[PDB]
Design an enzyme around this catalytic site. Structure first.
Site, PDB file in Angstrom:
ATOM      1  CG  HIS A  40      -0.619   0.429   2.503  1.00  4.62           C
ATOM      2  ND1 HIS A  40      -0.213  -0.456   3.480  1.00  4.62           N
ATOM      3  CD2 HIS A  40      -0.460   1.663   3.045  1.00  4.62           C
ATOM      4  CE1 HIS A  40       0.163   0.260   4.555  1.00  4.62           C
ATOM      5  NE2 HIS A  40       0.029   1.540   4.311  1.00  4.62           N
ATOM      6  CG  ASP A  84       0.019  -3.865   2.851  1.00  5.90           C
ATOM      7  OD1 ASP A  84       0.518  -3.413   1.784  1.00  5.90           O
ATOM      8  OD2 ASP A  84      -0.254  -3.120   3.830  1.00  5.90           O
ATOM      9  N   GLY A 175       1.986   7.039   8.686  1.00  2.00           N
ATOM     10  CA  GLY A 175       3.382   7.383   8.399  1.00  2.00           C
ATOM     11  C   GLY A 175       4.358   6.328   8.794  1.00  2.00           C
ATOM     12  CB  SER A 177       2.270   2.716   6.146  1.00  2.00           C
ATOM     13  OG  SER A 177       0.984   2.920   6.605  1.00  2.00           O
ATOM     14  N   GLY A 178       4.607   0.410   6.260  1.00  2.00           N
ATOM     15  CA  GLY A 178       5.706  -0.151   5.500  1.00  2.00           C
ATOM     16  C   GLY A 178       6.923  -0.493   6.309  1.00  2.00           C
TER      17      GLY A 178
END
Ligand SMILES: [Ca+2]
Length: 223
Positions: A40, A84, A175, A177-178
């Site tokens: 994402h 994801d 923020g 994320s990942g």
């Protein structure tokens, strides 16, 4: 990260910031040429920033390297966030040093109750917004799959796990994320999604990296 602490410069040397003019997602360095992040987080135009602490100040240990290729998981579903995960190849190899280092992939999955380190430059507030400049850290246990599925009925797959605190107060946030979830020295999760941040009975949900190790290793060996 809400409810966490300042990591300290270069204490999480595998943490990357993905930058498209601004920080927009975290990631994890898994060798000198490859980063793991969330699908994402996909966009064109990514520069990988390694060696960061304050993302707004050049402090001396940074390496900025453009992405040459992004590979979203073949089965990523953006509606549900199942699968994801994405790989990013660097245009040139990072220079590995103490400030910039890879994190090992899992050899097996982690168990409920295992403590993990979650890190990033996401929002630190649970009601409002405040974005840190320096990297934030949070220690959090993997939750039972039944509590995860109870928190988010109809939405947790075998490729996800929850971590954190059902009482609220400590979580990943926008923020982050990942970015990485590291447990016993292995990258077991990727910051994926949740409902709000640090709210009661709404823990973070993380991509379950151990299910992807074969795809990761095969993909990088062929690219
Ligand atoms: Ca910096």
């Amino acid at each position: 990260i809400v409810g966490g602490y300042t990591c300290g410069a270069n204490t999480v040397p595998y943490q990357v910031s993905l930058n498209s003019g601004y920080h927009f997602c975290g990631g994890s360095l898994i060798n000198s040429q490859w980063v793991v992040s969330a699908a994402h987080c996909y966009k064109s135009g990514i520069q990988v920033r390694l060696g960061e602490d304050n993302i707004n100040v050049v402090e001396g240990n940074e390496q900025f390297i453009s992405a040459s290729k992004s590979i979203v998981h073949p089965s990523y579903n953006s509606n549900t966030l199942n699968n994801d995960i994405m790989l990013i190849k660097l245009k040139s190899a990072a220079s590995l040093n103490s400030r910039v280092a890879s994190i090992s992939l899992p050899t097996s999955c982690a168990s409920a109750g295992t403590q993990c380190l979650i890190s990033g430059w996401g929002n630190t507030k649970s009601s409002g917004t405040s974005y840190p400049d320096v990297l934030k850290c949070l220690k959090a246990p993997i939750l039972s799959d039944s509590s995860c599925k109870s928190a988010y009925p109809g939405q947790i797959t075998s490729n996800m796990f929850c971590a954190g605190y059902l009482e609220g107060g400590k979580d990943s946030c926008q923020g982050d994320s990942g970015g990485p979830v590291v447990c016993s020295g292995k990258l077991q999760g990727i910051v994926s999604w949740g409902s709000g941040c640090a709210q009661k009975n709404k823990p973070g949900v993380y991509t379950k990296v151990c299910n992807y190790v074969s795809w990761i290793k095969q993909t990088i060996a062929s690219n």
